[model samples]
Structures are given as C-alpha cells and as structure tokens.
Target: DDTSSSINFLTRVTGIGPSAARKLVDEGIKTLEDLRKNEDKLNHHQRIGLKYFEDFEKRIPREEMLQMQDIVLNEVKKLDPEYIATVCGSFRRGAESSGDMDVLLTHPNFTSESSKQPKLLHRVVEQLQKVRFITDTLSKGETKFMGVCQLPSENEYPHRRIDIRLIPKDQYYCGVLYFTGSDIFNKNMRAHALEKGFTINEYTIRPLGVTGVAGEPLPVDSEQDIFDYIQWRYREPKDRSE
Candidate 1:
C-alpha cells in the first residue's frame, strides 16, 4: 500500500501510458501457483517489457517530484477541499526511484465516479496557463492531459514535459498497478488473469460470466485489496526493484 504511492506519483510526472503501466504489482511469478500456471505466459514480450520499464522513473529527481506534488495538491484542493484525493503508486511506497507521477481522487459522496475528470485538468491548467508555464496544450480530454510546461523560474531546473490525468478513487488500484508498472509485469498479470477466466484491465478486473457492461469497480480502499484480489503476497514498494 505504501509502496504503490510512489508508483502513482511517477506515473503523473513521467506520463507513463496506462494500459502498460502497472507491470509489477500483479507479478506472482515466484509463487508456485503462478509459476506453474503461467510458464509460457511469461514469454519474451513480458521479459523485454520489464527490462526497460523502470528507466523512465530512474530519471526523476525527488525534489522535483515533491514540487510536482505541491502543484498537484494545490490544483486538486482548489477544485474541492472535501475531495479525498492523493498521489499514489511508488511515491507512497517510498521508492527512491520512480517512473512517473500517479494520483487518485475521491469524495465521500462521489457517486458519479465518471463525472469528475474534465474538471481535474481544468483546475490544474487554469493555474498553470495563467503563468504561461503551460504554453501549449497538446491534448485535453475528460481523463487525460498531455502538454508541455516551461519553467518560469529557469534558475537550474528548466521547463519540461508534463501530463496530468484524473482517476476515480474507486479505480485507484487499477491506476496504481497500472501506473506503478513494469510493462512486463502488467503483461504477466494479464496472462495470469486470462488463464483464470478473468480480465485484468485498467478500470477493473472482472470474471467472465453472466454479466452486462456494468461490473462493479474493484474497491481498493488500500493497495492490499488489489494484492489479495490478484493473489500476490504484498511486497513493500522499495523491494520491488532490484
């Protein structure tokens, strides 16, 4: 749970793609059940994916990430104080190294999980654009933002690439595992999920059965919920890396 925060923070800063983001958390490769069941599933694609996965996270500086947190927290709070939003993934897990920034949001009464996204970017960009830091908008949508920010201070840390996204608290685990990722790890998890007649996805994991498009979002009140659901013994974030 603590380890996941760092991964989430890394996702935010580095702009890791969602589908391939959480490559590590679902890794039960060492588990006998996982190893025996997923021998072929852990194929070449997954192996190569894990190799380069942490490289982007390794590039980030801790001070900059803290600054990024300040900026994001201010942005989220500005939108609504009562919203229980936080940066998750590797940041919380205390990873000295991280790939991107990952964040999550929720409110006590947040019934419409899908409705809060458009405003998330608007709140951030409104402040950023005012300073001309966010000079150009590359993309803007309900759940994701991709653009550039110029360092107005320019003392030593110059402007850099930036992206922000919104995640419903209910989908936090999907975001955490997805963002705190090693791509190969994600592939491996998916392979395992598939073998067991379940679909592991960014929004939720669902068993294939008599169901409609509406399956309940996995309630990850904590990262451990995901670990239990995925059937892996929890590893603190720091130990995940070699």
Candidate 2:
C-alpha cells in the first residue's frame, strides 16, 4: 500500500496519530514490522501501542472488563471502604467492545484546596503495582496514573491500556460525566452550557455573570444537578454515545 493508505491505517492504532504516523513513515517505517523495529523512537504510549498493537485493535470482551472492574474495586476497598472506583469511558456507556479501560476513583477524605494531588491516589497505584497487575507506568500525577495491565493468569494475554483518575468526592459526579463521554456529545453539552450563560467541564459547572466571567462552582452532588443547571434532562451515560 501507499504511504497515504499506510498512514490512514496507522491512525486506527491507538496512541500514534497522524503526525506520529507521518514521522514514522518519513523515517522509512512502511509496515507493522518496520514500526516494530523502530520502537526505541516511540514514547511510552507508542511503545505500548506497538507492543500490543493487535491486542489494542481487538475488542476487549465485556466480561473481561467487568472482571477488571471487580479486581480494582476489591483492591481499593481493602485500603479504604469509603473510596469509590468506577469504570468509565466506553465501558461506562455499555460498549460491548472497548479500545481500553478507564477508571475514576474518589474519596471524601481526599479533598483539599491546598493540593489537587492526593496521597490516596499514589497508595492505590502502589497497591496495583505490588500485585503486578500494572506492568508499565506511562505517566503518574497526583490525580492520574496511566499504565498497562492484564489479568493475573498463567496463560498469556495482551496488556491493556488503563488510566486511573482521582477525583474529590464533591466533584465525583461531574468528573464521571466528563470521563464517561462520547467526545462529540461532551462538546455539544459544553456549547449548550455556554449558550445558557454557564460553563461546564470535568471539574465544575459555574454560572457566567453579566461580565461573562464565571462565578463559583455551583453545588453538584450528582450528575442530575449539572443537567438541572443547564436546563436539560439528564441523559444517562448509555444514551450519550453520540
């Protein structure tokens, strides 16, 4: 195939985009095998993408995702019973097949204005690493950790990409709404919020004042509160894959 078609094909693989694809091709990467040999040039995600290229392309069975969810929940609960963890993204939206897994976690005691980074975030990650479920760290921050994980089985399986986002309990619902998005639906909702003189994002929904400056975050204990403020009926995550 030509470079153009090859670039298009590469775009379907996770992590590597058009620019990265072009860069690879420019460097004479013309096939999966070619790309594989040049793995040293890729970033953490790109490396994972190449390592599990075929696996990432295949759909993650819903049963496997559920099993992964249970493992995360059980592990987190052992540390803090009050903490909450949920699978979001396509999994939350009830997709039978998913590109990767996403998880959102929150706890009431972890909130503080002085630090967006929380100790519990790292603790949970540490526990996962201890079990060897998480194989590689792509990145880590106070609120998020990106990595690859697999089922703890003797039989070999592909390492699937995962992201864990730590949220304060107060903003958990808003965080869930955003992370569970179909991107276009999120854009449309944000645009509508703007039209209604309010601003909505993963963190908060604030009212836009006469000066067009956003005011304080409205109290949002639930996803319904956000839809109420925006003057729209709450559409559940399953219905939001627009």
Candidate 3:
C-alpha cells in the first residue's frame, strides 16, 4: 500500500510509468532522493525525466506559453512563411498551466508518400537549435521530434518538454484537431461520429457503409470541415477542454 501511492506519484513524472516505479521500488528506491541515487538504472527518456524532474513537473504559466508560442511561430515563419505551426494540447485549450508543449507543424510540400521524407522538418529543427530555441533532442523522425526547449530571455527558464509533429498539408486540420484535444473530448467526438454511422480518426473521418465498414476518408480542408462532416458545431480550441 505504501509503494502503491509512491508508484502513482512516480507516474506523474514525465517519462515514468507504473512499471518503472515498481522496478525502482524493487531496487530499494522509494523516494525521489532514492530514485536520483539510482538514476543510472533508468533508460534515456527516464534519465531526462529525472534530470529535469522538477522543471518538467512545474506548470508552465499562461504568459510563458504565450511567449513560447509566439517565439516558435516567428522563428518558423522566418524559415518558411507558408509553414503553419501551432501549439496544441492544454496550452491551445487556454489552460493556465501546461504540462508540456505539443506543437503541430505542417507544410504544403509534405505528403503521405513521396520520393523520400522532406527536409523541411530537419531544417526547422536545425534552425531552432541554431538559435538555441531547442536545447536538446530526445528523438527525431520523419514526422515527429521530441526534445527540450526553453525561453531565450534573460529570465530564469527551465528546460521544457516539447514535441513537433509534421503533418501533410491536406491532413493538417485533422491533425491539429486531434492533437489539440482533451482526450475525453476526442473520445466523445469519435463516439458521436460512430453513432452517426461514421468513423473518425486523427487522420480523417469516413462514413460507414451498409456493412458498417468505414468508407474512404472524406476531404477535410479545415478543422471546421471535420466538425461539419460529423454534423458537430465547431468550437474554438480554447473551448475544446471537455
């Protein structure tokens, strides 16, 4: 019972989960101090989680989020004015404090299948790091980058969790809607779509056929289009907190 509560608390750490907590407890680690002493046992992500445990757990103020959003957007715009970048998740929902940053990056050039993955994502990450906007990279992929970023001001800023997701231009809106969601709201939306004989997913929403099989993904040009296809009134991202 003692370790149970501790394990639950451990799960609150950015990259920690129940299994990791249990492992720590088995190794005679019970408190944050104990865990820090045995830090070498953790995997890379967990290490970063512990390395900045306090900073990552702190709630990012709304003002800080605003500054982050603007700086990131402006930096990306200089690289390519047409690129669309948005901060999603609780920040987009206008939460007073955010757990981490979830950014959706889209460009007209990316597609589902191309000769190869475009260089836009790579270039953007490079640019951000060049100016020290991105502090460290945890992982990088064709469509996603998970890393750390901090404000460049003279103020004391802690490393913050940041993720950048590159989406195809055609599916950008769908991706934005999905990433901007409160999990509950998204689940409810999908359920409502199902009840309407349609299936909704992060990529697209499709009507169900007579056999209850999902049809082709319908065209969605904007977040509003997804709402329209599902016959749901569109709500602004700030109003999406379910």
Candidate that scores best on TM-score? 3
* Candidates' RMSD to native: 15.4, 2.9, 2.4
lDDT of 3 by residue, 25-86 (tens): 77877778877887688777777777787888688888888988888899899998989998
The 0-to-1 C-alpha lDDT of every candidate, in the order given, reads: 0.56, 0.83, 0.83
What is the per-residue lDDT of model 1 for residues 1-242, given as tens digits with 9 covering 90 to 100?
Answer: 66565345324323233433354324533322433355354434343223233342245566766776677677567767876556655665565544455556555543344565566556667776875656555566776765555444655343344566666666666666666655666677778766665677776776655553334455666767766776877755544442
Inter-residue clash pairs, candidate 2: none
- Arrange candidates, best lDDT first: 2, 3, 1
Model 3's C-alpha root-mean-square deviation from the true structure amounts to 2.4
Error (Å) of candidate 1 at residue 13 is 19
- Candidate 2's residue-wise lDDT over 1-242, tens digit each? 57698898777656788898888778887678877887787887777767777776667888888888888989999998998988897888988878688999988776646356558798998998888888877777888888888888875767788999888877888889988898988999999999999998898899998878657888888889999999998898888976
Cα error of candidate 3 at position 36, Å? 3.2
Model 3: CA > 4 A from native: 5-9, 115-118
- After superposing candidate 2 on the true structure, give the runs of residues whose Cα lies further than 4 Å from its correct spot: 9-15, 116-118, 154-156, 183-197, 230-234
Error of 3 at 218 (Å): 1.5
Candidate 1 at 75: error in angstroms?
3.7
- Tell me the TM-score of each prediction against the true structure: 0.56, 0.82, 0.87
Give candidate 3's total backbone clashes. Answer: 0
Candidate 1, superposed: residue stretches over 4 Å from native = 1-59, 84-117, 131-135, 150-155, 192-197, 209-217
Error of 2 at 94 (Å): 2.7
